[PDB]
């Protein structure tokens, strides 16, 4: 089966950027290979084909090239409506197989999160379950690390984070982590803590909180 | 034209669900259709293909004993049925229309695809979410959306009145199979004391409406 490899596997740029992605297969493919372009929530559009045909209604500034095990997207000066994921698709042989995607997005300033720490509360407790919520509100770049920490001991594989798409006005990021445990456990310990580390802080951010109080 | 799917499905393991995809009468004459499904947050997987004229098909070998494509000329519609399914078979499916370009291989030029259906599998049961608050220069609030199945939700703040710094994060699926998802929102720390926040939470799956106060 063939391996479709794209690379980067994401890219920062800016509108009027020249922008060219790659795409490697593991076999040799002829130029029977076609682009894509996919936003969330929508079907894939056709953009390229035969790797240099461009795809009627296409914008010029889309173009492709290509053979063998060696294939671009190049697009000459990027537009506010190109930020996306684009894939590359090989017609050469069955199973036809897909790259995993190169996706663009609007770069910025470097922007520092606000972070806020929840405490689960009293009506969930009362239900026998208790969730601590940590909350990184409009960041960039999208690279962040949060750090649970419960009586100064290290969790991991307890929690589960989210991260919302690239704000439309200003281009950040959000990210929700969200710690699980038993309502017996949330009562044995004291302090509940969340050390976030990102590009944006000179140094890590801890908010916490002690039970009950 | 447009290539129009059915609506969302929601199975347990080991039912099987059977997707549909309206064309039109020149459409399934004149050209192959594709099947080709997307995980959440993954890439593409290839299905298989058939010919509405006749309905011959070809299987990708991952598929080949549980998936059945057909096609129904009179009413310009094809379908794809997977059986066997299981919790790994979750995805968005999409019919794709196939343009005769590619001589030498035989391959596929997927010209227009229809808009994907949502296709859920889990041992899990319909259940409504319970809402609980996390309470509060600026200030940080929200509603925490818990245990419910299967998506979606939405979230609201005052009715549609409060949309300024909302977040609402898509959900994560719990050990339990149940989904959990937050919604926040920033405002001035001097409001706290004046204005009033509710989120409006919908899981029309399970007819569930729940409107809840986040006061600090």
């Known amino acids: 089966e063939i391996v479709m490899t794209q690379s980067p596997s994401s890219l920062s740029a800016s509108v009027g950027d020249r922008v060219t992605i790659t795409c490697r297969p593991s076999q040799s493919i002829s130029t029977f290979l076609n682009w894509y372009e996919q936003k969330p929530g929508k079907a894939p559009k056709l953009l390229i084909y035969?790797?240099?045909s461009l795809q009627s209604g296409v914008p010029s500034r889309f173009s492709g090239s290509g053979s063998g095990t060696e294939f671009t997207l190049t697009i000459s000066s990027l537009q506010p409506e190109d930020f996306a994921t684009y894939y590359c698709?090989?017609?050469?042989?069955?199973?036809?197989?897909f790259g995993q995607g190169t996706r663009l997005e609007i770069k910025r300033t470097v922007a520092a999160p606000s972070v806020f720490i929840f405490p689960p509360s009293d009506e969930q407790l009362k239900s026998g379950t208790a969730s601590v919520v940590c909350l990184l509100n409009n960041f960039y770049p999208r690279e962040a690390k949060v750090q649970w920490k419960v009586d100064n001991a290290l969790q991991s594989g307890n929690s589960q984070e989210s991260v919302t798409e690239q704000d439309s006005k200003d281009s950040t990021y959000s990210l929700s982590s969200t710690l699980t445990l038993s309502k017996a456990d949330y009562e044995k310990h004291k302090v509940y803590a969340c050390e976030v580390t990102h590009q944006g802080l000179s140094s890590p951010v801890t908010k916490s909180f002690n039970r009950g109080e | 034209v447009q290539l129009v799917q059915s609506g969302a499905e929601v199975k347990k393991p080991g039912a099987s669900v059977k997707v549909s995809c309206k064309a039109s009468g020149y459409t399934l004459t004149r050209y192959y259709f594709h099947w080709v499904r997307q995980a959440p947050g993954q890439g593409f997987e290839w299905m298989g293909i058939i010919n509405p004229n006749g309905g011959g098909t070809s299987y990708a070998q991952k598929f080949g004993d549980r998936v059945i494509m057909t096609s129904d000329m009179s009413t310009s519609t094809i379908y794809m049925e997977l059986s066997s399914l299981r919790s790994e078979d979750t995805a968005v499916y999409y019919c794709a229309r196939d343009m005769p370009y590619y001589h030498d291989s035989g391959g596929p030029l997927f010209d227009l695809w229809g808009q994907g259906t949502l296709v859920t599998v889990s041992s899990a049961s319909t259940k409504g979410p319970s809402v609980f608050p996390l309470a509060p220069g600026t200030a940080a609030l929200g509603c925490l959306v818990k245990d419910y199945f299967p998506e979606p939700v939405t979230v609201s703040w005052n009715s549609g009145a409060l949309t300024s710094g909302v977040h609402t994060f898509p959900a994560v699926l719990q050990s339990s199979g149940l989904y959990s998802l937050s919604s926040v929102v920033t405002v001035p720390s001097s409001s706290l004391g004046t204005q009033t926040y509710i989120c409006n939470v919908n899981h029309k799956p399970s007819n569930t409406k729940v409107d809840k106060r986040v006061e600090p």
């Open positions: 698709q090989q017609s050469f042989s069955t199973p036809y197989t």
């Open positions: 035969d790797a240099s």
